Design a protein around this ligand. Structure first.
Ligand SMILES: CCC1=C(C)/C(=C/C2=NC(=C\c3[nH]c(/C=C4\NC(=O)[C@H](C)[C@H]4CC)c(C)c3CCC(=O)O)/C(CCC(=O)O)=C2C)NC1=O
Ligand SMILES: CCC1=C(C)/C(=C/C2=NC(=C\c3[nH]c(/C=C4\NC(=O)[C@H](C)[C@H]4CC)c(C)c3CCC(=O)O)/C(CCC(=O)O)=C2C)NC1=O
Ligand SMILES: CCC1=C(C)/C(=C/C2=NC(=C\c3[nH]c(/C=C4\NC(=O)[C@H](C)[C@H]4CC)c(C)c3CCC(=O)O)/C(CCC(=O)O)=C2C)NC1=O
Ligand SMILES: CCC1=C(C)/C(=C/C2=NC(=C\c3[nH]c(/C=C4\NC(=O)[C@H](C)[C@H]4CC)c(C)c3CCC(=O)O)/C(CCC(=O)O)=C2C)NC1=O
Ligand SMILES: CCC1=C(C)/C(=C/C2=NC(=C\c3[nH]c(/C=C4\NC(=O)[C@H](C)[C@H]4CC)c(C)c3CCC(=O)O)/C(CCC(=O)O)=C2C)NC1=O
Ligand SMILES: CCC1=C(C)/C(=C/C2=NC(=C\c3[nH]c(/C=C4\NC(=O)[C@H](C)[C@H]4CC)c(C)c3CCC(=O)O)/C(CCC(=O)O)=C2C)NC1=O
Ligand SMILES: CCC1=C(C)/C(=C/C2=NC(=C\c3[nH]c(/C=C4\NC(=O)[C@H](C)[C@H]4CC)c(C)c3CCC(=O)O)/C(CCC(=O)O)=C2C)NC1=O
Ligand SMILES: CCC1=C(C)/C(=C/C2=NC(=C\c3[nH]c(/C=C4\NC(=O)[C@H](C)[C@H]4CC)c(C)c3CCC(=O)O)/C(CCC(=O)O)=C2C)NC1=O
Lengths: 241, 159, 160, 65, 160, 160, 159, 159, 160, 160
């Protein structure tokens, strides 16, 4: 019983150092969520939430990037609490600062991925979810784009009204893991080139000739027509070529 | 426990607050007692697995019964190997001072694993309770308290 | 997409009306839908038993569940069960649709990227999908097990 | 044009074990074209809407919001 | 990761219990943690003074802060101070952990990509990290300055 | 909620099994579902024509669309069309469910609060919903127009 | 099943798509068979609770044993009352055609309730399996299939 | 079922009455479903013997107990071989459509055989009941009914 | 807040140094912290047993768990257990802090609003908190049960 | 490259003369060269026996040599023996050089590209290299088997 679970190999240094990271990255159980559960009379626990929000929705910081710092009314309405955290993230996304950091040097295709990385915490899932957001960036502003982004029932069923977004590691949809890792492994302002431009439609390698009792049915039923079909009188069924 | 405070102060933009430095200094002070407790549980492993299998198969005979999972010598050897694994993770948690490197390897997905293996989880919890009782008999009072700490975490986790 | 929707699309992009070959394809689909539905019902019966039998056939008592293997940690065992349940469920969807396009659209899209990123062994996954295919072809019969094995082998071939 | 709304969310699907007190009941300001989908989202959860109040805006004014 | 967590991982992937060499490693870490904590406290004291002295040693009055240099614009000077504060802070974290893996995971991951994308000079950054290392080795003493300079030279070597 | 779900709930909160009166209620619902579905289809046909005819009957060429009225600004005219489309759509949902609880849960919850906050005239809204009810009772027939007018009058009565 | 399609098309801004109208028309057609199955399970309730208690206490005697929860006449009466509740919710799900009004009253928070009552959930799952077997003996083949549908949902839910 | 009608009309001096010809034509029509049911029970045999041994040794532990007959690996292997034999005869009866070629090989002298082997017959009946339950879980509703037919004949025969 | 932090705040808002009465308060807190910690440990031992015994004392076999009561649905029973676990846990926090301000800040803030919104009976909650207080005063002893009952009665009095 | 050439290069790119740490590295290499040469001689003795024992341990009597496997065709079996002989020979070269750069330059350069192009299973190759490592560590002793297993595990880790 001290033999069913001992390895018989050695595992020296590169095999010792690769099986350490033999799965999903360590950042999953270490990205600590920020939740507004402190209370109204706290002026200290909300400071960490405000700086945390600037760290999530903006990539780096806002200290060496704006002169006369805004959001002071937003920080005040947060500390007093007539405004949830979700409306504070709204005010951050509305500001012309964020418009100058991410909308102005980047195209309309790339802003969809850079805008769903910040708010929803993950890359867009398939092509139709790029199409709807591109139409919203088509006949409406970004002030409606991030608006319809955050007001979906995916933001408010996952993050909730009083949490800041945190970096999600999604599993269930198609290629929603590796696009997100390709987005999040890159640092800020690292590659100007678009990470995922679109979703290339791939063709199948079986159309209908296989699936071989759909295919057996093609045959069996094609030959069903010319076997005597006894339902009507017999004399009409010897005179059919 | 240092990774806990580091990612805790890392989610914030602040440094490590010096109360966290005090708890790291205190853990650094208690590390020698932690190492002695871990070595005492290390060298006496087969006694602990023997007495755990003793108390478990006296407590729940259905794993012994042929409808249960641990029927036969091969399945009962796999059972005591599972108890050996959990004792090993308990020694890891005793050294690390906080239950992260033991939950990361033994807790975080155990319910669906044992569900798709057919074994009941309550019998595994009773096995870790038997390990806690045997290690409580093996150690002194202040050592058995600090071992029954992490054993208690595993027993609460498997339920 | 469906087999119906694929036939309609292939007739549409030519501007063609529904000729007799397309009607043959749709009538063959309407003939095979009986055993398609019955197979999907009995696969939805005991999917957990199929996944359990498949890991007991292929993956268990190997080095993969030993330390050093990719299924050693218990969260990785749970992720393995999740991936096999995904393969069986999407193969059920592709069997009932009669068209493997949903496998290409929802499963096989960025999966080799993920499995080479995480260091997941591909050959053990292929053998696990093979054991899934053998278990469900035994469970459902040969006549629907052929169509189940077609889409499971489609997942296995696209994975490799 | 902002509204002051007090509202409650049911949280029927799961048995949350955290604090989760702010979400069930809140008093928040929401802008004009935003309160529309907020209304709709609050009604999606079966939430009670206690009281809708004008914070900012004179009603009946056409230019200048 | 820690030095504790690295020792536990290296003992875990073999399925090995904690043998005496691992206990030696953990007891050496528990011996060195005293000066580790004291060094981290006095580096957290005056990080701004260290960054100021480092740019006054290495980067100031060069062509880099002149027009044409990469630190001419005042937002670029602020970004320079931010990057040096990052190097010092993450070197403090790696010193207190006793394991340079957080430097590899959080700093040195995609940093040469960024610095070659923006046109940031790499050699001036290496000399600035060197001046940081000299200033903090003077400030903290030689005995903890060795361990601080190990991780700062790790950042400098991975950057090059 | 449904009429089915309301019957099941009323039988559930007593701990009662399905007695014959509840089976009568469910069988009456299963009898009326034919014209329920046909009415919902033809109301989904031409909802825009119904809203256009209703504003042409009740609201147009009044002082409400003149300056000073609440429908003078063109965004307010678009909001009026939106509110009438909401009333017709949710009345269609309540007609097909056979239970007005979705009107109470999704429309009539905080609506008088909103209409007294914005200064929206309530009596003109009631007359517009009345004109909606007359137009759809003409369009669908009397037999389904009764059930459509029940939920539209429910909205009108809760609004007042 | 009408609330399912209505909130399904209600999350979208679209109307009810006519395939959903086809499924509502088909459910409306099958409602008479649903009502007959529900009445047949209705009038024969005490037989089903008797045979379920029979097969359960033959299968798991620990609820009968004094360490278990259902020890004594009062606790065993509460046990058969729980089985009566689950049969009632199964009849509700048979009429409604979709498992929402039975999951809303019996499934959605059952694990923490039975955990803080001390009872095991696997014995409740075996009790609903015994109810499914007794109703399979009580009904015809096409009726037992359609009853074992929702009984199967409850058995999968309690696990 | 053709031998049944043939010896039935053969004891008489009359021919095969055409109602018997109707029942032979109907059996000839249902033979394809019979063959699919038999192949589905054929390819999944070891699962059925495993779950039958599971449910039997959970139900009656005296065969496991050393006073019983099926004590030890050799005797329990002979026990599961007997269950394999009975599953094989059930597939024969499923194909033949009438219980003659299964009663001729497994029923007609079984009581004195099991009496002079020492084994109880009620445990064998419980084993065939467990086979019926496992095949009922394996098949669809109209297939499990028609399999539980012949399984029911064996269970009634062993008692 | 603490008792320490409350003493420091009361000395701070006057600009007062730490006089002898504040030192008496802090030394009384440092005397009582022994049994405070021991009581918190044994309450953290068996919180589930305390909640189980409290619902078996007060809420079970009433009309509240019968149909029509507020604890009839099983999600409502789970929500009841959650609320009682919250009351016990926050009373443990207020006992170890020695100051009921965290009860006022985290529990008793908007709780009557929620319980009158949902239709939760308040008197049954007060009796359940009373049964919690009796069970933990029996379990921990009288000397720490007094301080536990002070904060549990604080929750009960603010709830009413 | 060598260990000597790597030490000379690391001293050269700084413009540094040979300091005492580099002389320590070269003298450690000149100490270990004895067993390096003896190990290389006895591995060059019976390389064919090592490859035969490794395929008999890992690859033989599996599904890989059965039809459908990648080693079914006899040219593919010969290619398998060729690849394993390559791994053993280049691991011998890297052991005698004391530097794994020739593995990175000559073996591990475009090898995953080739093995994913041909459909070669990677995990079976890793297990075959593992069996090679166990056989040669048994054959040469533990003291040189450590250094042989370091470069064979380097090939295995770069392959994955
Ligand atoms: C619907 C199609 C689809 C698939 C398949 C999918 C897979 C997938 N498998 C993952 C991990 C994993 N996948 C496996 C699976 C395996 N490793 C093995 O050794 C076996 C050969 C194989 C199981 C048969 C394991 C062990 C992990 C754990 C890695 C880790 O999380 O540390 C991850 C990383 C994050 C997570 O599980 O939650 C994804 C996204 N996502 C999808 O959307
Ligand atoms: C644009 C219009 C506008 C105003 C005025 C505004 C005020 C405002 N003043 C606040 C606090 C405060 N306001 C004051 C101000 C004063 N107390 C005194 O003794 C003086 C008489 C007076 C200064 C002249 C102080 C001292 C606080 C601190 C209370 C605290 O945070 O603990 C807060 C609480 C949260 C926070 O500051 O960040 C708000 C929201 N918000 C607004 O959106
Ligand atoms: C270190 C983290 C870790 C855990 C937790 C773990 C569990 C684990 N338990 C297993 C089997 C098993 N586990 C048990 C368990 C038990 N016997 C009982 O009756 C009780 C319920 C329980 C222990 C007292 C049994 C009986 C088997 C064999 C089951 C089978 O063969 O299907 C297996 C499959 C066989 C194997 O590869 O060992 C794994 C992977 N493995 C790990 O690497
Ligand atoms: C935690 C690890 C980490 C680092 C280091 C990091 C660096 C980093 N430095 C940047 C820019 C910069 N980095 C520098 C730094 C330098 N240029 C010089 O001439 C000097 C040699 C050197 C300072 C010592 C400058 C001048 C810029 C400004 C370029 C610009 O924004 O126009 C940017 C572009 C966007 C931004 O600052 O906000 C990033 C992401 N991000 C990280 O996450
Ligand atoms: C699903 C149930 C539901 C309703 C009804 C609803 C109504 C609603 N009507 C609004 C405005 C309005 N509603 C009306 C409607 C009317 N005024 C009149 O004179 C007429 C009597 C009446 C039209 C028949 C008008 C004119 C406005 C414009 C006020 C403004 O935006 O300036 C607003 C303010 C913001 C916005 O339209 O986008 C809401 C929320 N929301 C809901 O969720
Ligand atoms: C309709 C939704 C619904 C559910 C699910 C429900 C469960 C429920 N089960 C209870 C007790 C109980 N439930 C059981 C259960 C069992 N006997 C066993 O051994 C098995 C594990 C299981 C049934 C076969 C037992 C033994 C008790 C009494 C436990 C006690 O008194 O502590 C109680 C407390 C006493 C009562 O008020 O009836 C509730 C509320 N109540 C509901 O209204
Ligand atoms: C196809 C027709 C057919 C039948 C029915 C049959 C029965 C049969 N059962 C036997 C033994 C056995 N049969 C059992 C039976 C059981 N284990 C139990 O506890 C239960 C009571 C039962 C099955 C679950 C046992 C335990 C033995 C070994 C008894 C002994 O060795 O004396 C033997 C003697 C050993 C042998 O040659 O296999 C025969 C011939 N053989 C046949 O060819
Ligand atoms: C930390 C302080 C705190 C409390 C107490 C709190 C309570 C709280 N109790 C709730 C519901 C509930 N609360 C109760 C509790 C009771 N009803 C009774 O009959 C009993 C008298 C009493 C239990 C002792 C019940 C039965 C519900 C269910 C209502 C429902 O969800 O349908 C809800 C609605 C949403 C949800 O549970 O997840 C909240 C927010 N939140 C908090 O943040």
């Amino acid at each position: 019983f001290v033999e069913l679970g001992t390895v018989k190999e050695n595992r020296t240094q590169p095999d010792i150092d690769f099986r350490i990271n033999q799965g999903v990255t360590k950042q999953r159980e270490q990205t600590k969520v920020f939740k507004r559960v402190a209370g109204i009379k706290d002026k200290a626990a909300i400071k960490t939430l405000i700086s945390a929000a600037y760290r999530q929705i903006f990539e780096r910081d806002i200290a060496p990037y704006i002169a006369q710092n805004e959001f002071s009314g937003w920080e005040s309405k947060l500390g007093n609490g007539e405004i949830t955290v979700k409306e504070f993230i709204e005010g951050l996304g509305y500001s012309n600062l964020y418009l100058k950091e991410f909308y102005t040097p980047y195209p309309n295709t790339k802003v969809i991925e850079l805008g769903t990385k910040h708010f929803l915490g993950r890359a867009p899932i398939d092509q139709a979810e790029i199409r709807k957001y591109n139409q919203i960036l088509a006949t409406q502003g970004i002030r409606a784009f991030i608006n319809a982004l955050v007001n979906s029932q995916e933001y408010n069923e996952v993050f909730g009204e009083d949490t800041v977004p945190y970096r999600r590691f999604p599993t269930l949809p198609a290629a929603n893991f590796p696009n997100t890792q390709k987005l999040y492994n890159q640092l800020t302002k690292q590659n100007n080139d678009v990470v995922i431009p679109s979703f290339k439609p791939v063709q199948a390698r079986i159309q209908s000739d296989k699936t071989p009792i759909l295919a057996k049915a093609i045959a069996d039923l094609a030959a069903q027509a010319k076997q005597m079909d006894k339902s009507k009188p017999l004399f009409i069924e010897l005179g059919r070529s | 426990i240092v990774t806990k405070s580091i990612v805790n102060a890392d989610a914030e933009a602040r440094y490590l607050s010096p109360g966290e430095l005090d708890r790291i200094k205190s853990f650094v002070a208690g590390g020698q007692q932690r190492l002695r407790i871990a070595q005492a549980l290390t060298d006496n492993r087969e006694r602990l697995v023997k007495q755990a299998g003793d108390q478990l198969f006296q407590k729940r005979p259905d794993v012994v019964s042929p409808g249960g999972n641990a029927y036969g010598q091969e399945m009962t050897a796999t059972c005591l190997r599972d108890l050996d694994y959990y004792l090993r993770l308990v020694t890891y948690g005793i050294v690390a001072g906080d239950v992260t490197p033991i939950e990361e390897i033994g807790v975080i997905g155990v319910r669906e694993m044992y569900k798709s293996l057919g074994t009941p989880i309550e019998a595994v919890g009773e096995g870790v309770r038997a390990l806690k009782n045997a290690a409580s008999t093996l150690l002194s009072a202040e050592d058995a308290a600090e071992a029954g700490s992490y054993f208690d975490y595993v027993v609460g986790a498997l339920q | 997409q469906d087999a119906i929707t694929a036939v309609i699309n292939s007739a549409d992009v030519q501007g063609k009306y529904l000729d007799t070959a397309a009607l043959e394809k749709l009538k063959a689909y309407f003939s095979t839908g009986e055993l398609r539905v019955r197979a999907a019902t009995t696969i939805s019966a005991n999917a957990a038993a199929i996944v359990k039998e498949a890991v007991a056939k292929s993956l268990l008592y190997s080095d993969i569940t030993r330390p050093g293997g990719n299924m050693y940690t218990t969260r990785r065992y749970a992720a393995c069960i999740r991936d096999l349940d995904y393969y069986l469920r999407y193969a059920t969807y592709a069997m009932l649709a009669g068209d493997p396009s949903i496998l290409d659209e929802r499963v096989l899209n960025g999966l080799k990227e993920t499995y080479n990123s995480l260091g997941v062994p591909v050959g053990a996954t292929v053998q696990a999908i093979q054991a899934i295919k053998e278990v469900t072809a035994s469970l459902v019969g040969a006549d629907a097990g052929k169509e189940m094995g077609i889409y499971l082998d489609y997942i296995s071939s696209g994975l490799s | 044009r902002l509204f002051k709304i007090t509202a409650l969310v049911p949280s029927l699907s799961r048995t949350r074990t955290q604090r989760e007190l702010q979400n069930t009941y809140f008093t928040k300001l929401v802008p004009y074209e935003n309160w529309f989908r907020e209304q709709q989202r609050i009604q999606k959860a079966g939430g009670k809407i206690i009281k809708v109040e004008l914070a900012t805006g004179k009603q009946g004014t056409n230019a200048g919001l």
